[PDB]
Design a protein around this ligand. Structure first.
Ligand code: R5V
Ligand code: ZN
Length: 889
């Protein structure tokens, strides 16, 4: 088990200037001929020439056209090719090889592999070494000349990086295409696609240089009609980078390709972007609403990789957050601008405070720039990506738009055509910071702690108001809990976007203000404050922290009703819920522990319920926001606030609170569900694939959320509404009818009905599987077994496997069954999956990430299953390391 350390970075003793590839695809094998035009670097010390090379079958290797022999001149152990230094030349030389690989049986979906009837590659982070020998690290920049050959009937469309410079026929019904890509690039950006691909195309003319750019979106013939939205999103992405950042696309063509078998969302490769089909393809008849925001963000994400990727490459993989955090941040800016709905930002905050906060207090906790790794495939985390983006976002919050866009330009210019680090980015933003403060002594050295320090900071508040002085004070304290990464946590640079709300008319009292907290504690004072304000803190969620506002529920309700900032309204609601949840939880827990025959529960705040009704009945209020306030905080958000969480007791707590609110607002819920129908289910643009209305989709979200609440509560004759819902042409609607019908006898009837609607579309069926998997059924285990035997079977498609099992793991009452049957089931699935796809196996370990936060019995059950998984003789390095770190072993 080798461990790479960030402090151990040293440049290669070798140089690769030119790569010349010949990839010959055949029925039962793929032959890869490679010539590497190499040289000796200034850091060389006469060491052995060591190439990365995993699972390569050597036909022959050479240096300067002379064949090398095994044992005397080189050794190969299926991981590293070692050529002894005495046989390594002193100056410019040519290394060549011919290996055999097998994309057909490559079920790990890394390197070159076959997805249905498409040959496709995935080289990030260390996948290129699975195709041919190379010094597989991102700082090895080279030129690429790639030739691909295959059977024309099976693979008429051949794609790779750069320009297609030659097409030719080959005896035996075969053909070739040659691609030349002159600009330097790292090997993880290499890509190749072969298949019977159909496409939609368009020409984009750039804003400034008026350059014409060919846009292509590819898929298998069956789903070519689902390519339209992707093309529109690409156009949107190009326009946005031109209008906001003032950047145009550098190349003359851009290809997007959908494949059915993909480990993640998508991949950026210079001009050739490859996507999980579920993140590129959609139609209104065959997709749920979520696909449309999903495709927008993922297409945007891969597009925004281009500009920066063309000018600055990572020095090493420890700087991953520099390219991913920044791109997710640009992606988020894009999406917020495109959707023009406040729930877009809210959803990102929702995901961070649930999934990433869990990770950051788990034994897997790490900084966005880690100090070490064993497997790079476990490096791509919500911390690196989503906390990373929040850290990138805070630069904009501190600097403002003008000085941010300015510090961004400094970063590009200063690091053009070379490898950079996170500190290079901080340095550039520091130059903008000095200029903003108009004092050249200003610095952002403390800000670097955001990169090196793990864990989520806690920010708490106390207040004072002097009526006679008209003086208002905000006392702020920050704290980060020590962990395995740092014994002593340092104070961070925390930007606190604030406003002060006049409680008697709801007006803003002060201008836009961002408090800069740089110490463990500070007191911020405001003069000329005519009345006691209600503080609106961390507007837009301006720092990735735990917020302890120390407000009363009455104060929180007034923010919820009258504040101008969506997040603070949403957070105020969240805080009211959390206070109620913790109170009722402890009450239920005491009853259980003391075996009480009778006990009391604290009712939900009546004024809070009044506030919800007020907002729901406001026709000028946002439908998306409304769906958030009638929903309790996510379980994974809640668990960060409870020690030794009894999942049954939490389930009882949620049930009580939902019923409390339902017993008061169910009539309002029903009235709204009916009145929203017209606008939410409007069919005017149902056959226009380029017309996407995010507000309308939010209305459907509200309706489906309300329907769920009404179905659970068994509202009189709601089954009628459920049945009529199933007849809706919108998949979001008729899949909702399935899940909410779980509380009725008509469930298995809609099960069959929605299955027939879903089975002839690959992606739609996967959404059906998800819906079934997440269904609130008492017989969910028998239902899962049915899915395995009748639909899923022995599929190795990651989308299929994730769809069947992951939603079920969110079933608080059932997955966490006290017998451990749920833990045992998922562990069996992880072990089975690990045999062919280690990455997806690790993804399936997701529910275990909170193992040490549960009650003692459930802790023991999960730990038992993880130790059982760890003792599998054939366990992958990926899963092994992941479980070793998670179990603190
Ligand atoms: C959907 C999302 C934006 C999270 C995504 O697909 N991200 C890509 C990415 O950065 N594309 O440019 C991504 C996610 C995980 C990996 N990865 C995970 C393990 C090894 N690589 C690679 C790429
Ligand atoms: Zn990315």
């Amino acid at each position: 088990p080798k461990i790479h350390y960030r402090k151990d970075y040293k440049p290669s003793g070798f140089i690769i200037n030119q790569v010349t590839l010949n990839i010959n695809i055949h029925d039962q094998e793929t032959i890869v001929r490679s010539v590497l035009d190499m040289d000796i670097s200034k850091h060389n010390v006469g060491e052995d020439l060591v190439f990365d090379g995993v699972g390569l079958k050597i036909n022959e290797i050479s240096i300067n056209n002379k064949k090398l022999v095994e044992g005397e001149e080189y050794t190969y152990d299926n991981e590293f090719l070692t050529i002894f230094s005495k046989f390594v030349p002193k100056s410019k030389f040519a290394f060549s090889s011919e290996v055999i690989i097998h994309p057909e049986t490559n079920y790990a979906l890394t390197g070159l592999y076959k997805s249905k009837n498409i040959i496709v590659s995935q080289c990030e982070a260390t996948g290129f070494r699975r195709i041919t020998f190379f010094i597989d690290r991102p700082d090895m920049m080279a030129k690429y000349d790639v030739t691909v050959t295959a059977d024309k009937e099976k693979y008429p469309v051949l794609l790779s990086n750069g320009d297609k410079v030659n097409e030719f026929e080959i005896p035996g019904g075969r053909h070739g295409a040659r691609f030349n890509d002159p600009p330097l690039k790292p090997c993880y950006l290499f890509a190749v696609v072969a298949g019977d691909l159909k496409h939609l195309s368009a020409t984009y003319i750039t804003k400034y240089t008026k350059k014409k750019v060919e846009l292509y979106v590819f898929s298998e013939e069956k789903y070519v009609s689902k390519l339209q939205w992707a093309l529109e999103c690409l156009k949107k992405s190009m326009a946005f980078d031109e209008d906001y950042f003032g950047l145009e696309y550098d190349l003359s063509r851009l290809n997007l390709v959908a494949v059915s078998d993909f480990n993640v969302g998508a991949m950026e490769n210079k001009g050739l972007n490859i996507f999980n089909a579920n993140s590129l393809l959609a139609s209104k008849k065959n997709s749920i609403d979520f696909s449309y925001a999903r495709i927008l963000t993922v297409v945007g994400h891969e597009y925004f990789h281009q500009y920066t990727g063309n000018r600055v490459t990572l020095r090493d993989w420890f700087q991953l957050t520099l390219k991913e955090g920044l791109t997710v941040h640009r992606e988020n800016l894009f999406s917020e601008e495109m959707t023009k709905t406040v729930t877009t930002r809210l959803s990102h905050v929702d995901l961070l405070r649930s999934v990433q906060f869990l990770e950051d207090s788990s034994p897997l906790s790490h900084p966005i720039r880690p100090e070490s790794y064993v497997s790079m495939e476990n490096f791509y985390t919500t911390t690196v990506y989503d906390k990373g983006s929040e850290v990138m976002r805070m630069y904009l919050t501190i600097l403002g738009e003008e000085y941010y866009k300015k510090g961004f330009d400094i970063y590009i210019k200063k690091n053009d055509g070379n490898t950079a680090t996170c500190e290079d980015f901080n340095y550039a933003m520091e130059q903008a910071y000095k200029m903003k403060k108009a004092d050249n002594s200003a610095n952002l050295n403390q800000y670097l702690l955001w990169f090196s320090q793990s864990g989520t900071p806690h920010v708490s508040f106390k207040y004072n108001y002097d009526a006679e002085k008209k003086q208002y004070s905000i006392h702020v304290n920050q704290y980060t809990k020590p962990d395995e990464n740092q014994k002593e946590k340092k104070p961070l640079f925390i930007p606190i976007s604030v406003g002060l709300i006049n409680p008697e008319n709801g007006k803003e009292m002060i201008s836009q203000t961002t408090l800069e907290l740089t110490k463990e504690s500070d007191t911020f004072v405001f003069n000329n404050i005519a009345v006691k304000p209600i503080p609106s803190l961390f507007r837009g969620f301006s720092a990735p922290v735990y917020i302890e506002d120390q407000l009363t529920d009455e104060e929180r309700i007034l923010l919820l009703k009258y504040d101008s900032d969506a997040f603070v309204r949403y957070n105020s609601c969240t805080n009211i819920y959390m206070k109620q949840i913790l109170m009722n939880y402890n009450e239920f827990l005491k009853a259980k522990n003391e075996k009480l025959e009778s006990f009391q529960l604290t009712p939900v705040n009546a004024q809070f319920i009044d506030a919800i009704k007020y907002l729901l009945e406001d026709p000028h209020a946002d439908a998306g926001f409304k769906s958030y306030i009638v929903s309790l905080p996510q379980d994974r958000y809640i668990i960060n606030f409870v020690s030794n969480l009894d999942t049954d007791v939490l389930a009882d707590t949620k049930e009580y609170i939902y019923k409390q609110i339902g017993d008061k607002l169910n009539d309002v819920y029903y009235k709204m569900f009916k009145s929203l129908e017209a606008k939410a289910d409007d069919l005017t643009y149902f056959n226009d694939e380029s017309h996407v209305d995010f507000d309308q989709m939010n209305m459907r979200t509200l309706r489906n959320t309300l329907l769920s609440l009404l179905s659970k509560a068994q509202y009189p004759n709601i089954l009628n509404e459920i049945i009529e819902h199933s007849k809706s042409p919108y998949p979001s609607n008729w899949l909702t009818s399935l899940s909410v019908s779980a509380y009725f006898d008509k469930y298995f009837e809609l099960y069959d009905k929605t299955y027939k609607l879903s089975k002839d579309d690959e992606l739609l069926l996967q959404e059906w599987l998800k819906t079934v998997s997440r269904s609130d059924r008492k017989d969910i285990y028998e239902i899962l077994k049915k899915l395995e035997n009748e639909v899923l079977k022995d599929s190795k498609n990651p989308n299929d496997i994730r769809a069947v099992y992951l939603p079920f793991t969110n079933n608080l009452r059932r997955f966490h069954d006290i017998s451990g049957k749920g833990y045992k089931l998922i562990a069996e699935v992880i072990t089975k999956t690990d045999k062919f796809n280690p990455m997806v196996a690790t993804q399936l370990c997701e529910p275990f990430k909170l193992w040490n936060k549960l009650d003692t019995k459930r802790q023991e059950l999960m730990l038992n299953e993880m130790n059982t998984m760890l003792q599998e003789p054939q366990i992958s390095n990926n899963l092994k390391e992941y479980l070793l770190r998670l179990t603190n072993k």
